[PDB]
């Protein structure tokens, strides 16, 4: 490959440069209107995510089938960690878009959305409390892409995963963190990915339910991503 040859700084720069843009919403809400805005936004973000994925070091070296599997498994995790990251500087609120800032009360517009809204808010507070840096964020999101579906198939993938781990440690060591503080922070960050997975699973459970399929006509692409999780 060519991802393993890159240095720890070349890895960060490649990930920061590959960062997808922050899209805007469609300029009070009901259940239909709320789901409509989120669906429309998520559908447009997916297009940028796919192109972001190809710019992730070592992802183009993967076969087409494996690229599909990884994206199908982690797409909601990636959307959610992006949402959580954007909402870091907005405590108690979720920044879906610069023109779409919502709180937990607006999460009551859709039946069963509040519980997941709270989990997302809790993740954002955790990122804020840890003072998560953008350099660390792009590493975590790339890890999600490569790891979430790696055990549903790969030595190359785990090699890149180790490379991002080396990248994460290098970032903390270049921040003045002691050896103990480094692997402690590394652990704290990766444990949050377990919660991101949980939020995705609970979220996915409602989204591909018949009652949520019918509330608003979803795009064919978004349906294919949803139907991948049955």
């Amino acid at each position: 490959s060519l991802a393993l040859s890159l240095t720890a700084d070349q890895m960060v720069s490649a990930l920061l440069d590959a960062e997808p843009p922050i899209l805007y919403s469609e300029y009070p809400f009901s259940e239909a209107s709320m789901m409509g805005l989120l669906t429309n936004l998520a559908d447009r973000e997916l297009v940028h995510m796919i192109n972001w994925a190809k710019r992730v070091p070592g992802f183009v070296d993967l076969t087409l089938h494996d690229q599909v599997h990884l994206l199908e498994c982690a797409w909601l995790e990636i959307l959610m960690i992006g949402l959580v990251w954007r909402s870091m500087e907005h405590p108690g609120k979720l920044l879906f878009a610069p023109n779409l800032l919502l709180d937990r009360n607006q999460g009551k517009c859709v039946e069963g959305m509040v519980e997941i809204f709270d989990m997302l808010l809790a993740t954002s507070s955790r990122f804020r409390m840890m003072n998560l840096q953008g350099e660390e964020f792009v590493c975590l999101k790339s890890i999600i892409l490569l790891n979430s579906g790696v055990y549903t198939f790969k030595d190359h993938i785990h090699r890149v995963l180790d490379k991002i781990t080396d990248t994460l440690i290098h970032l903390m060591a270049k921040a003045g963190l002691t050896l103990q503080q480094q692997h402690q922070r590394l652990a704290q960050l990766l444990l949050i990915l377990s919660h991101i997975r949980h939020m995705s699973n609970k979220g996915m459970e409602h989204l591909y339910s018949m009652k949520c399929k019918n509330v608003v006509p979803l795009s064919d692409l978004l349906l294919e991503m949803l139907d991948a999780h049955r």
Binding site: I50, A53, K54, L64, Q67, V68, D220, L221, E224, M225
Partner: peptide, 9 residues
């Protein structure tokens, strides 16, 4: 799938 098309583009 559409994902195939968006990945090859």
């Amino acid at each position: 799938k559409i994902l195939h098309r968006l990945l090859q583009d």
